[PDB]
Amino acid sequence: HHHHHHMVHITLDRNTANSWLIISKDRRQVRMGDTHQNVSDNKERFSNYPMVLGAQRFSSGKMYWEVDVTQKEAWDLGVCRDSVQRKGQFSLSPENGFWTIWLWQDSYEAGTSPQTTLHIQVPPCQIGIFVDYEAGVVSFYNITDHGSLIYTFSECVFAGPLRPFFNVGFNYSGGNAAPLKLCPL
Numbered sequence: 772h773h774h775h776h777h778m779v780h781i782t783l784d785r786n787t788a789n790s791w792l793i794i795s796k797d798r799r800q801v802r803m804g805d806t807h808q809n810v811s812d813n814k815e816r817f818s819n820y821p822m823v824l825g826a827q828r829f830s831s832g833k834m835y836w837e838v839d840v841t842q843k844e845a846w847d848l849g850v851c852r853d854s855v856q857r858k859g860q861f862s863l864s865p866e867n868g869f870w871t872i873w874l875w876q877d878s879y880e881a882g883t884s885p886q887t888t889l890h891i892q893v894p895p896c897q898i899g900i901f902v903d904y905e906a907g908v909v910s911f912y913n914i915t916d917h918g919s920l921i922y923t924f925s926e927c928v929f930a931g932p933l934r935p936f937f938n939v940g941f942n943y944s945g946g947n948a949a950p951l952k953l954c955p956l
């Protein structure tokens with residue numbers, strides 16, 4: 772692809788993090804802690820899942836960023852409305868304000884309702900995410916495979932400001948402790 776010139780410097784917003792996450796000092800890496808991380812509760816925190824938002828809000832333009840997923844067995848990535856539900860159980864869908872892909876149990880899916888099987892021959896170690904606000908597009912690219920297209924959500928109805936969205940996943944297996952990292956420009 773040719774989206775690299777729309778690169779934006781994303782940072783994680785600690786206040787939105789599930790209370791078990793550890794965000795690095797530079798706000799560019801997030802991972803699940805061993806226990807709870809000794810923060811007060813607030814209405815912004817995701818309660819049920821190991822999720823966090825980027826600090827940046829987008830309401831126009833074209834934006835691009837990259838995320839490192841090396842070693843991980845499970846994660847969700849994409850964008851979401853600033854006003855998505857934080858508490859309780861919910862599915863990742865455009866109806867609920869999410870435009871996401873994921874890895875789970877050795878398969879890659881897009882967060883449509885119902886979910887859509889992705890066809891990935893080269894397991895990605897870094898994912899590129901492109902948003903065109905005006906066009907209503909969110910696209911995902913396999914950086915490990917020369918930028919090949921993974922998935923395009925088109926005809927998106929954002930209906931609000933967008934924030935970068937992350938889920939590091941649970942670590943019941945002991946094989947999913949590695950971080951999500953925002954990769955340098």
Ligand SMILES: C[C@H](NC(=O)C1CC1)c1cccnc1
Nearest residue numbers: 803804805806941942943948
């Ligand atoms: C407490 C624990 N935390 C981790 O494993 C962190 C090191 C990644 C845990 C337990 C069960 C499911 N997910 C996570």
